[PDB]
């Protein structure tokens, strides 16, 4: 099947140039039947086409963008590449690469889209999360555990991915978006996992997987009750 | 050059209400607009193509009508699974998205399970200590999580955490999390959470003493 998968960095220095390739398998990007663009989305706000290149080496440029943008094509890596220059916390965003010039001999929409790379541009380095188990000093409710995660100050808020060595019948992860601290720059979230008490007896424990960033995921102990 | 305007910026439907998107184009761009449907975490998928066209996998209920400047898009049954963020795109000119309407499902009132976790030891022996607040699954969005300790009211110590929609139960959950120093957590007995919300009656709160869990 055609896949597109972006590759780029998780920060970028501000005023420094960001540089986002995107690997595609299953279609010849110098085919004549379809173009190639690169969107992107700012948190929270809408979806902004970037660029678009063709094998010809003819290239579509956002108006806004044109100035600070590059896009090109390698056809022997079978890759295409966006440089945006000069970026500030305005370009903080998800970057997607995708196919166009589907039906028309013109970029007309998007199909399909690569997964999306985020990018920030901050001053900033990465801090990992501090991970801790947290135990329910609430009831216990109606014959399941409830345990918790708490991944406390880490940057960049994304990629946060918190996963358990729990799951399936009975057995219910909760993820929560990262929040700022109001400590300053760091952010914070929790997971929660709620099992059947038989899955989470006394003196065991579970393990919940913090994957963040590029780095290892930390595994930690969680004591069941 | 040409500007998409999507109205509105969000909307609440019920289950089987007759959802509508308009998008404006500022000039003339025929039929080339599509509409894209984008869950969260996930990049947008087509679900209209030329204004009125289904692409595969898309149920018929959604649809599109129009030509010209004026589009609109449509939901004709609200299901919770279509509750996501929806744009338009033009290709007359170049290519420009609207600025995106996120749908939210409207459903019965259902109040928050509410679950307090004191500071861990690891984080105390870090230096740190954070009350974390959990409140799961719960309609509507709106809930209010009042930290007190020792009967004070907690300001700017604490941080909210709302999920998304579940695309299921169309409920919310919420974590709240109100991080102190060690220095001020020991100097302090009471910790509690306060929930208020819709579907309780009265105030929920959950409390512990320090050190007694």
């Known amino acids: 099947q055609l896949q597109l998968q972006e590759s780029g960095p998780g920060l970028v220095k501000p005023s420094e140039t960001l540089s986002l390739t995107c690997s595609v398998s299953?279609?010849?990007?110098?085919?004549?039947?379809?173009?190639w663009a690169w969107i992107r989305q700012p948190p929270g706000k809408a979806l902004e086409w970037i660029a678009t290149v063709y094998y010809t080496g003819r290239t579509y440029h956002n108006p806004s963008l044109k100035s600070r943008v590059a896009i090109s094509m390698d056809t022997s890596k079978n890759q295409f590449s966006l440089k945006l220059r000069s970026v500030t916390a305005a370009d903080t965003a998800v970057y997607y690469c995708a196919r166009t010039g589907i039906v028309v001999t013109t970029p007309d929409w998007f199909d399909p889209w690569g997964p999306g790379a985020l990018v920030t541009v901050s001053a900033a380095s990465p801090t990992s999360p501090k991970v801790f188990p947290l135990s329910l000093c609430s009831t216990q409710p109606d014959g399941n555990v409830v345990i918790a995660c708490l991944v406390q100050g880490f940057f960049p808020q994304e990629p946060l991915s918190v996963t358990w060595s729990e799951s399936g019948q009975g057995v219910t992860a909760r993820n929560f978006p990262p929040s700022q601290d109001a400590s300053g720059d760091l952010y914070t979230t929790s997971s929660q996992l709620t099992l059947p008490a038989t899955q989470c007896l006394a003196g065991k424990s579970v393990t919940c997987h913090v994957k963040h960033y590029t780095n290892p995921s930390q595994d930690v102990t969680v004591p069941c009750p | 050059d040409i500007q998409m305007t999507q109205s509105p910026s969000s909307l609440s439907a019920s289950v089987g209400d007759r959802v509508t998107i308009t998008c404006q184009a500022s000039?003339?761009?025929?039929?080339?607009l599509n509409w894209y449907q984008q869950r969260p975490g996930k990049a947008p998928k087509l679900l209209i193509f030329?204004?009125?066209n289904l692409e595969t996998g898309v149920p018929s209920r959604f649809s599109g009508s129009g030509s010209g400047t004026h589009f609109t898009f449509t939901i004709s049954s609200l299901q919770p699974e279509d509750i996501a963020t929806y744009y338009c795109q033009q290709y007359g000119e170049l290519i420009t998205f609207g600025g995106g309407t996120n749908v939210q499902m409207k459903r019965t009132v259902a109040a928050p399970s509410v679950f307090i976790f004191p500071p861990s030891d690891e984080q105390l022996k870090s230096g740190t200590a954070s009350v974390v607040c959990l409140l799961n699954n719960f309609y509507p969005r709106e809930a209010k999580v009042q930290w007190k300790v020792d009967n004070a009211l907690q300001s700017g110590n604490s941080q909210e955490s709302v999920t998304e929609q579940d695309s299921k139960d169309s409920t919310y959950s919420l974590s709240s999390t109100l991080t102190l120093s060690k220095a001020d957590y020991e100097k302090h007995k009471v910790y509690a959470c306060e929930v208020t919300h819709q579907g309780l009656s009265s105030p929920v709160t959950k409390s512990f003493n320090r050190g007694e869990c």
């Open positions: 030329d204004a009125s």
């Open positions: 299953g279609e010849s990007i110098s085919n004549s039947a379809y173009y």
């Open positions: 000039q003339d761009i025929r039929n080339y």
